[PDB]
Amino acid sequence: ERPTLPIPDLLTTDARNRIQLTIGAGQSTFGGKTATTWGYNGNLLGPAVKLQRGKAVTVDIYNQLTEETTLHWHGLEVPGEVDGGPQGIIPPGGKRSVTLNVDQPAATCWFHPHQHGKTGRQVAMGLAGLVVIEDDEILKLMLPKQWGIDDVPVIVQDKKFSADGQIDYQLDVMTAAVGWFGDTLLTNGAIYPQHAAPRGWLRLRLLNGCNARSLNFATSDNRPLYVIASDGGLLPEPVKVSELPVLMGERFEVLVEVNDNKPFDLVTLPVSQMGMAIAPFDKPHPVMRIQPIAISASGALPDTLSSLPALPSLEGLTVRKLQLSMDPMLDMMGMQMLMEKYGDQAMAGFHHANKINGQAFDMNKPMFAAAKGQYERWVISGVGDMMLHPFHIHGTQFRILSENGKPPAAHRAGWKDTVKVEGNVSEVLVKFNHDAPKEHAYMAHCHLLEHEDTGMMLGFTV
Ligand SMILES: [Ag+]
Ligand SMILES: [Ag+]
Ligand SMILES: [Ag+]
Ligand SMILES: [Cu+2]
Ligand SMILES: [Cu+2]
Ligand SMILES: [Cu+2]
Ligand SMILES: [Cu+2]
Ligand SMILES: [O]
């Protein structure tokens, strides 16, 4: 009765070493009602671009929208010139080609628009894809590896729709303060899908592709999840968890056991984030149904996944302070609107009003030049402010030293491109191995997209 989990195509290069991505407007059905949606190579979401470490690929990006957009590869360590930040304009009806020389370990990354001031909308409308980066190392592990059967991407996103069927997106005082969130949960575009998985291990590549909703993954019968990777690749070993908090733009890959005749749900648990526990999200919410199939999966859960370097010495490293803030007026007005619409349940558990170091994002004025090839220490503070800011830095995979006032949890102590900042201070160890000049600067920003779109971003050069 549930629709099957849609599986994004795993797209590799053709004879010319090219991948074609068409950005376009189509239609989808939600709850039997049609909406205009945008997608990459289809109506909605996108394919998974498969990359190999050490190899180049050229991506041809045809923008068939009637408005401008950009194409960013979130999690990829590439020069600014192909980063697809807001300076990477692709005119409506035009084409832009980018050559990606992949130089990082195996990981599940993703891609989405980075259009100046409109990224929340373009994502809400449907635009997101995946990136599966492979290397020599990972294939030796014998992980579940059959794409769409025992190795599946799970892109989880919320939307809200108006009475006429259409996606109801707005960037206004309330959303700019608390984020765009909705009442309907999608999994690879589908409402409460089911996925048929063989007996043994199921690998789920989880992406929180929500604009502003943080999620927290668990199983309906509390079977454990074994985390094997974070934003930037494998952990040294599996880390067993009963629940998995995932911030906006974060990825984790987990293994979960599948047994004959015992279906279970992947669920998300209520989070203590402003706006995000309004019913049906005040209770555990299903994400998808796992249907065991009485066929043996070949995949293993290895004792040992890979190696993390020790953290580099802290003495002598440059420190950059990035103070996050939101105009007090934006905050009071936004939270009032939140409380007035939804009341107390909204606490269960403006275009340049959001800033970093007192400055709302200035596309023409990068805030600093970072060293190339040198570890730096970036200290990101949300002190003075009560909103959730998952802070993301372009052009790198860093190590978390402190996450919002604490040492990182085990499954969060490996390769990360996002870090939690919420009323406290975070510190990360970051290195950039590629150039980004002022014309194609790197972004560092909050990934609660409505904050980003209203100033909580800076450009930096390498
Ligand atoms: Ag006011
Ligand atoms: Ag409140
Ligand atoms: Ag705030
Ligand atoms: Cu992103
Ligand atoms: Cu990014
Ligand atoms: Cu934020
Ligand atoms: Cu970004
Ligand atoms: O991003």
**Same domain for 348 and 272:** no
Q: Is residue 237 assigned to a domain? A: yes
Domain boundary residue, one of 145, 166, 191: 145
For ligand 8, whether the C-beta of 434 sits within 6 Å is: no
The verdict on residue 304 lying in a domain is: no
Quote the CA–CA distance of 137 and 423 in Å, as a whole number.
Answer: 39
Please answer whether residues 102 and 75 qualify as being in contact, where contact means their C-beta atoms are separated by less than 8 angstroms: no
Distance CA 321, CA 335 (A): 27
Final residue before a domain boundary, out of 232, 263, 297: 297
Specify the DSSP class assigned to residue 16. T
Show the domain range for 226. Answer: 146-297
If asked whether residues 190 and 164 sit together in one domain, one would say yes
Ligand in closest contact with the CA of 326? 3
What is the largest distance, in Å, between two alpha-carbon atoms of the chain? Answer: 60
Specify if 131 maps to a domain: yes
Which residue spans within 117-241 are E strands per DSSP? Answer: 129-134, 151-159, 184-187, 194-208, 215-219, 225-230, 233-241
- For the Cβ of 72 lying below 6 angstroms from any atom of ligand 8, the answer is yes
Q: Residue 88 C-alpha to ligand 8 middle, in angstroms?
A: 13
Structure determined by: X-ray
32 shares its domain with 168: no
Same domain, 275 and 369: no
Taking alpha carbons only, the member of 429, 194, 211 closest to residue 314 is 429
At which of 112, 145, 178 does a domain end?
A: 145
Length of the chain: 462
What is residue 450's three-state secondary structure? helix
Looking at the fold, whether 68 and 39 belong to one and the same domain comes out as yes
Give the Cα separation of 381 and 224 in Å (integer).
33
**Same structural domain for residues 62 and 135?**
yes
- Determine if ligand 8 sits within 6 Å of the CB of residue 394: no
Whether residues 271 and 367 share a domain: the answer is: no
Quick check: CB of 431 below 6 Å from ligand 8?
no
- Comparing CA positions, the residue from 257, 12, 36 lying closest to residue 125 is 36
Is 16 part of a structural domain of the chain? yes
Q: How many structural domains are present in the chain?
A: 3
**Alpha-carbon dihedral sign for residues 123, 268, 238, 256:** negative
Beta bridge partners of 117: none
Q: Within this chain, do residues 204 and 261 fall inside the same structural domain, yes or no? A: yes
Resolution (A): 2.0
Q: Are 348 and 432 members of one domain?
A: yes
CA-nearest of 161, 163, 158, 143 to 191 is 158
Kindly state whether residue 307 falls inside one of the protein's structural domains. no
Chain center to CA of 35? 23
Nearest ligand, CA 248 = 4
Within 10 angstroms of residue 341's Cβ, the number of other Cβ atoms is 11
- Using alpha carbons only, how large is the chain's radius of gyration in Å? 21
Q: What protein residues have CB closer than 5 angstroms to ion ligand 4?
A: 74, 249
In the block, residue with structure tokens 């390769």: 415
Whole-angstrom Cα distance, residue 142 to residue 77?
Answer: 26
442 bridge partner residues: 460
Same-domain pairing of 95 and 6:
yes
Do 131 and 157 sit in the same domain of this protein? no
The CATH number covering residue 209 comes to: 2.60.40.420
Asked whether residue 78 falls in the same domain as residue 156, the answer is no
- CB of 121 sitting under 6 A from ligand 8: no
Ligand 5 centroid to residue 414 C-alpha, Å: 17
